[PDB]
């Protein structure tokens, strides 16, 4: 059970980091029209 806990904790942290860093990576510019959005 402790192994399962750590596994899930790590998985969740990984995915959430992808989400956050993902939206931090110049997201407003990922649109088809105007790119300069800063």
């Amino acid at each position: 059970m402790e192994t399962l806990k750590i596994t899930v904790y790590i998985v969740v942290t990984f995915f959430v980091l992808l989400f956050v860093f993902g939206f931090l990576s110049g997201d407003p510019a990922r649109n088809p029209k105007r790119k300069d959005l800063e």
Partner: protein, 451 residues
């Protein structure tokens, strides 16, 4: 008559306030006038409540929501939350009401008579939404103000009478907080608690030292932050992450407010420290627990050994164990064993409910309180017929906790919706396609087929 029709502004009448986006003077007017409405309602509602107030009925039988707020701050009440002097309520009402005139005046002046834009009038009060520096400076001012507000509560608790403490020894009483919790471990420890059952996150705060100390931390944080934002301008990583526009900022605040609305809903539903039950009525868990207690007391007086009475399911009729072993009340109320209240805690020992204390130490004031709370459970109909849905007419009662929680859930929800609306629109408008797809440049047509 600038931007006051659909032709010039581009906006129909039903989105008329959008015509205000770049007219800073008029927008200021709208805001000041609106603040006027808020303060007005505070004053008038307080006076209304005061005029309908009978000191010898519990507040919670009287449809009161603002007076309980004032009484919690320590004004007008004594031991057990008995009302000793209604005059502070009166003051709080009157002052708020008077103030609303001033604000109103300001609002109206800026709204119709004053400069429509401020930028030419004053570079200080004037702002461009896209000026990140100016925006963070205004933000800084407002953070400093909020910080002062938080410090005001601390000043009341420590230097001006104290606060009402439902947990004070000998029944509730107003108490001066002399040693607020300053240990960051405790304070932010609350911030790191699970929001689930038995943990309850920040809703779980159950003593006034923590409330006060937490507000000291909040005040210092807000003031320091306000200075930080006045003195700085957003960094590159921040600059690339956000949309920088009025509607965007509005949408951010809308999300903020939604979140706060939901939190407020849970606070008023579960917490009986900063929302004392003497004023607001018992919480749902509290009333359920109180029913169990009431019948344990009654049947024990009749000769039942409550510790050994087996119920129809095989679980104890009166007492059972929680999933981690603590002795708790039985029946459906098994769900509410996380409840803590001053009327129950004397019966608590290291292993939960103590059978010996149950047998020997139950005072009449406890029986009284359990009966009262059990018969004032926060259940009632929309036309204020108290009790379960199947109850007959007789008791004119809906709990303050229900009114507050429901109202604030509705508001928080619609504010989340507003957040989506305005954030999506802000994105579309910043990128240039909020009015529709350009026919000569439809992006999808420039994309490969999916299949």
């Amino acid at each position: 008559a600038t931007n006051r029709d659909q032709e010039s502004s581009g906006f129909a009448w039903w989105a008329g306030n959008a015509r205000l986006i770049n007219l800073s003077g008029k927008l200021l007017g709208a805001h000041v006038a609106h603040a006027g409405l808020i303060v007005f309602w505070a004053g008038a509602m307080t006076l209304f409540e005061l005029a309908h107030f009978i000191p010898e009925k519990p507040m919670y039988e009287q449809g009161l929501i603002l007076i309980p707020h004032i009484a919690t701050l320590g004004w007008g009440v004594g031991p057990g939350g008995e009302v000793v002097d209604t005059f502070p309520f009166f003051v709080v009402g009157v002052v708020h009401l008077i103030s609303s005139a001033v604000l109103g005046f300001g609002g109206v002046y800026h709204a119709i008579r004053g400069p429509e834009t401020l930028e030419e009038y004053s570079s200080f009060f004037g702002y461009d939404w896209k000026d990140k520096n100016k925006m963070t400076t205004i933000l800084g001012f407002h953070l400093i103000v909020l910080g002062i507000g938080a410090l005001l509560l601390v000043a009341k608790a420590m230097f001006f009478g104290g606060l009402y403490d439902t947990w004070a020894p000998g029944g509730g009483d107003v108490r001066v907080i002399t040693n607020p919790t300053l240990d960051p471990r405790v304070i932010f420890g609350y911030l790191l608690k699970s929001p689930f059952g038995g943990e309850g996150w920040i809703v779980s705060v159950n003593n006034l030292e923590d409330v006060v100390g937490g507000h000291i931390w909040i005040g210092l944080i807000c003031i320091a932050g306000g200075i930080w934002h006045i003195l700085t301008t957003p960094f590159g990583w921040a600059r690339r992450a956000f949309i920088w526009s009025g509607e965007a900022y509005l949408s951010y605040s809308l999300g903020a407010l939604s979140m706060m609305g939901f939190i407020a809903t849970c606070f008023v539903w579960f917490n009986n420290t900063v929302y004392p039950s003497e004023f607001y009525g018992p919480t749902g868990p509290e009333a359920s627990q109180a029913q169990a207690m009431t019948f344990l007391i009654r049947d024990q007086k009749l000769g039942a050994n409550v510790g050994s009475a087996q119920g129809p399911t095989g679980l104890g009729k009166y007492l059972m164990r929680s999933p981690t072993g603590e002795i708790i009340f039985g029946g459906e109320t098994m769900r509410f064993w996380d409840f803590r209240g001053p009327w129950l805690e004397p019966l608590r020992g290291p292993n939960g409910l103590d059978l010996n204390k149950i047998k020997n130490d139950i005072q009449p004031w406890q029986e009284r309180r359990a009966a009262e709370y059990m018969t004032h459970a926060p259940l009632g109909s929309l036309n204020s017929v108290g009790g379960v849905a199947t109850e007959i007419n007789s008791v004119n009662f809906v709990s303050p906790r229900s009114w507050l929680a429901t109202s604030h859930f509705v508001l928080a929800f619609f504010f989340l919706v507003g957040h989506l609306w305005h954030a999506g629109r802000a994105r579309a408008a910043a990128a240039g396609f909020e009015k529709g797809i350009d026919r000569e440049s439809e992006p999808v047509l420039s994309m490969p087929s999916l299949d």
